[PDB]
Design a protein around this ligand. Structure first.
Ligand SMILES: N#Cc1cc([N+](=O)[O-])ccc1O
Length: 252
């Protein structure tokens, strides 16, 4: 395939947290206008990740999905507080192409075969959060705090086997850093699974993305780095092409 540049939008109350620095938008903080803007300038897939806990927070997502699905041309993934089949089913049907699950996946791994059987494996993204514990990659859950004792070697083969469509590979050690994708972790996972692998956490500069794809990543996601305008998405794509990565450009 080619390699994707996925962009990720963190939501509270259907708002984009800290918004964005594109002064040309009408509502920097509006996910719909931001998301559709990223789809006009190079992003290949978008993530809508909701940090809302609240009472009517399942509605605010089903709302925004509906508004987003009529407007945005590229694939959309949703995750944030998705713990059961009800919530995913309702989200895919309201307009979500893929639903992300994590803790609920590790706690009942058949929720992914469940979502898969109904909506197709392509609709199921398993986010795996891992950090080194005593020289050994472990899967963590609950926002990367609960050391589940499942080592990643095995979770990556289980996830594939249970029917997931793609994995987001997030290195907890890189949260907030801007040193680069954990390319050791990517290289460690790469032979364990034929599934598409989305690199996440670390991105700080252009060249980090070239590193991520040589480590075997099928895609790289970042967020703040694009919204702050540290890395201009179009620049990022001309670079990746300059040095032999297969990425889709536009050319006007
Ligand atoms: N994808 C993703 C994602 C996950 C987390 N998270 O599992 O805390 C936060 C922000 C994100 O964009």
């Amino acid at each position: 395939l080619a390699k994707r540049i996925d962009a990720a939008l963190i939501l509270k109350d259907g708002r984009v947290v800290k918004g964005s620095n594109f002064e040309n938008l009408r509502d920097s903080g509006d996910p719909v206008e931001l998301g559709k803007f990223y789809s006009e300038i190079g992003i290949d897939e978008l993530s809508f990740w909701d940090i809302t806990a609240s009472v009517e927070k399942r509605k605010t997502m089903l709302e925004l999905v509906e508004k987003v699905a009529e407007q945005i041309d590229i694939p959309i993934t949703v995750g944030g507080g998705i713990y059961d089949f009800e919530t995913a089913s309702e989200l895919i049907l309201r307009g979500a192409d893929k639903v992300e699950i994590n803790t609920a996946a590790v706690e009942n791994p058949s929720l992914i075969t469940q979502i898969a059987q109904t909506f197709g494996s392509q609709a199921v993204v398993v986010y795996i959060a891992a950090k080194r514990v005593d020289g050994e990659f472990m899967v963590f859950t609950y926002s990367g705090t609960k050391n589940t004792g499942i080592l990643l070697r095995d979770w990556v083969v289980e996830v594939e086997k249970r029917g997931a469509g793609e994995i987001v590979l997030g290195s907890i050690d890189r949260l907030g850093t801007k040193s680069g994708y954990d390319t050791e972790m990517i290289r460690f996972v790469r032979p364990l699974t034929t599934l598409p692998i989305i690199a996440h956490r670390g991105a700080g500069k252009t060249e980090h993305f070239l590193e991520a794809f040589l480590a075997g990543a099928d895609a790289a996601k970042a967020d703040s780095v694009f919204h702050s305008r540290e890395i201009d998405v179009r620049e990022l794509k001309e670079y990746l092409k300059k040095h032999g990565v297969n990425v889709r450009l536009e050319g006007l």
